[PDB]
Design a protein around this nucleic acid. Structure first.
Lengths: 10, 10
DNA sequence: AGCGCT
DNA sequence: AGCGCT
């Protein structure tokens, strides 16, 4: 996720 | 990806 | 440090 | 079987 905690997605 | 080869994303 | 399958 | 970081 994020970043942080990519996306989703990308 | 896909599925197959989710998304991205989800 | 944390998303989702056919 | 295959996406992407700050």
């Amino acid at each position: 996720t994020x970043p942080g905690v990519t996306x989703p997605g990308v």
